[PDB]
């Protein structure tokens, strides 16, 4: 009665593992990396029914970003100065002039014998340094000399985190989950097809997620496994928290020719008082925000248990502090002033976070490399949107006494999956068969 009939152009698909294009300043690395334009993207096609299954914890788009962002970064800064010759014994004293007390011992004033453009002459030069980049001998040396020759990031390369969009290649499509409050896994009932994702800013940070998207309705707490203390908990806020960060001290920059076309940028004398870098977080806003987080958090905890927030104890700066880059400088701020509370499970104007900065930055774990950010002249003023948090559980024996929770670090994948959870890529499979009542 029926014979095989072949149908081509059948609207079906399978899970894909593919490479997305990227789509979009002169100096900005992402601006020059992907020129593929995007903006006129009312290309979203609602799919009735479907109910596609998503799993953000296995999302290979996150993995792609990790690989490509690191590559772009390294490629962009590979052809710069390579300040191997800066790794010499330094003669240092502390900067002790127009300073505050919180800066005592923070800055060093070091002199050294630097090469000149001629391979027979040396010059006496000096630079100010942050103590976090300089290690005492038994005289001082730069800390990186233990593992790596370092470079100098090019002053003409911009890492402003302009948003980029990802687009699927022909034969592939991206399924977007529109299920409001989708936790991150399972049968998303409302999906649409796009060729290109919305723009995501490639912002690098620990503890606090900055300038990402906000939840459409209510604060969302999600994790791969909420009962596993080995897993991170990602929290998306439905409102931003305003954070104002600054680097006081009007700095200047020297330019030293160390070789035939090789310039090194030293930190020169500071104009005005020397003060500590810091961030200002609205007190009330933060309070309200965590109140919402705990009210949601309680979904997975015992009745009237007591929940606390605590100091980010751990072994390093990328573990215990809030790292970020703004104004071109790398900040390591102390967030213990934020994560300090008890919610009682029955309760009824600016937190200042002291902050330090560094120039010799490894970026992504690693043993060697490191980019020596050059000095920035003048002062830095940054205002950001805290859009989310990364936290962990203690996982101890339970005798009431719920986790005191700590913010923490991790690799960059967790700062992207927080946005990428909405997308899945599938392969289109247009060829298939069905029985039909026909013959040639």
């Amino acid at each position: 009665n029926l014979w095989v009939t072949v149908y081509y152009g059948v609207p079906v698909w399978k899970d894909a593992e593919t490479t997305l294009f990227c789509a979009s300043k002169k100096h900005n690395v992402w601006a020059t990396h992907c020129c593929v334009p995007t903006d006129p993207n009312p290309q979203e096609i609602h799919l009735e029914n479907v109910t596609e299954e998503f799993n953000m914890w296995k999302n290979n788009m996150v993995e792609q970003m990790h690989t490509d962002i690191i590559s772009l970064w390294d490629q962009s800064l590979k052809p710069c100065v390579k300040l191997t010759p800066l790794c010499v014994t330094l003669q240092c004293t502390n900067v002790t002039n127009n300073i505050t007390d919180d800066m005592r011992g923070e800055l060093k004033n070091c002199s050294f014998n630097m090469t000149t453009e001629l391979r027979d002459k040396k010059q006496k030069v000096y630079s100010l340094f942050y103590r976090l980049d300089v290690v005492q001998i038994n005289e001082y040396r730069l800390i990186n000399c233990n593992t790596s020759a370092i470079t100098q990031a090019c002053p003409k390369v911009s890492f402003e985190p302009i948003p980029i969009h990802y687009c699927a290649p022909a034969g592939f499509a991206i399924l977007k989950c529109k299920d409001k409050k989708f936790n991150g896994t399972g049968p998303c009932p409302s999906v649409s097809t796009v060729q290109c994702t919305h723009g995501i800013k490639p912002v690098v940070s620990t503890q606090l997620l900055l300038n990402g998207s906000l939840a459409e309705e209510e604060v969302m707490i999600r994790s791969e496994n909420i009962t596993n203390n080995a897993k991170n908990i990602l929290v998306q806020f439905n409102t931003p928290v305003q954070i104002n960060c600054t680097r006081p001290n009007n700095n200047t920059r020297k330019s030293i020719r160390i070789g035939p076309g090789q310039w090194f940028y030293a930190t020169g004398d500071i104009i005005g008082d020397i003060r500590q870098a810091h961030c200002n977080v609205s007190k009330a806003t933060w309070n309200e925000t965590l109140g919402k987080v705990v009210k949601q958090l309680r979904k997975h905890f015992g009745n009237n248990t007591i929940i606390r927030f605590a100091n980010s104890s751990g072994g390093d700066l990328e573990v215990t502090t809030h790292s970020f880059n703004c104004g071109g400088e790398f900040f390591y701020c102390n967030t213990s002033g934020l994560f300090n509370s008890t919610w009682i499970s029955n309760t009824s104007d600016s937190i200042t976070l002291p902050c330090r900065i560094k120039q010799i930055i490894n970026m992504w774990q690693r043993i060697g490399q490191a980019m020596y950010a050059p000095p920035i002249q003048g002062v830095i003023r940054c205002v950001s949107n805290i859009t989310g948090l990364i936290l962990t559980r203690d996982g101890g024996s339970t005798n009431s006494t719920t986790e005191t929770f700590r913010p923490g670090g991790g690799d960059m994948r967790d700062n992207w999956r927080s946005e990428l959870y909405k997308y899945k890529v599938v392969k289109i499979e247009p060829l298939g068969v069905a029985p039909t009542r026909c013959k040639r």
Partner: antibody
Amino acid sequence: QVQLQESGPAVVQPSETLSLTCAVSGGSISGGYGWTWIRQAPGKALEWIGNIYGHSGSTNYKSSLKRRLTISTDTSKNQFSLKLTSVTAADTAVYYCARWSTADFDYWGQGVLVTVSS
Amino acid sequence: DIVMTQSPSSLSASVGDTVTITCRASQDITNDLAWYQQKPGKAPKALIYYASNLESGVPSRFSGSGAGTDFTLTISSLQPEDFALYYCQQHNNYPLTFGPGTKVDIK
């Protein structure tokens, strides 16, 4: 802290539009909260109507009312409101506004008893 | 829709008694249940959220537990101010749904 307060017509005639406004004080209309309309018909259990978010719209309506019901806000007066067209006798209820947060309604107003009658 | 019901429809009690009422879902709603206290003339006061967590301003005599479809509200040492109607609601999905309520009367 937060105080909600409803106002509007106590009597609406059949076929007309009912419009109730819930003023918000003690907090902002623009916050990340679900502004919600709920009504309790006389002699009946409480029934959910719908909601709107202070920072995003992104409303939720009882589907049976979606062709008659509009929920919106006005940030200049720090208020939200319920607009229901083509009212009938079955819509007699005391309407309350409430503030939804995560798992419950933290704040409630006083309510407006609305009768649908010529 | 997820339909909520309650049992008993009414309960008689004295002051100091421990009383309980049961809320039942037509669908498994894991722990997305909230309980309220309604007094004549007023909007209800939230009591308990996520099946068992006490809301602020609620006396410690209020407790409860449950999962899936079967949930219980417990009031120990019932006080004269507690002779109220109690409601449960699910917020697992839309429409948000309230049960019929249980009226607690004083003997």
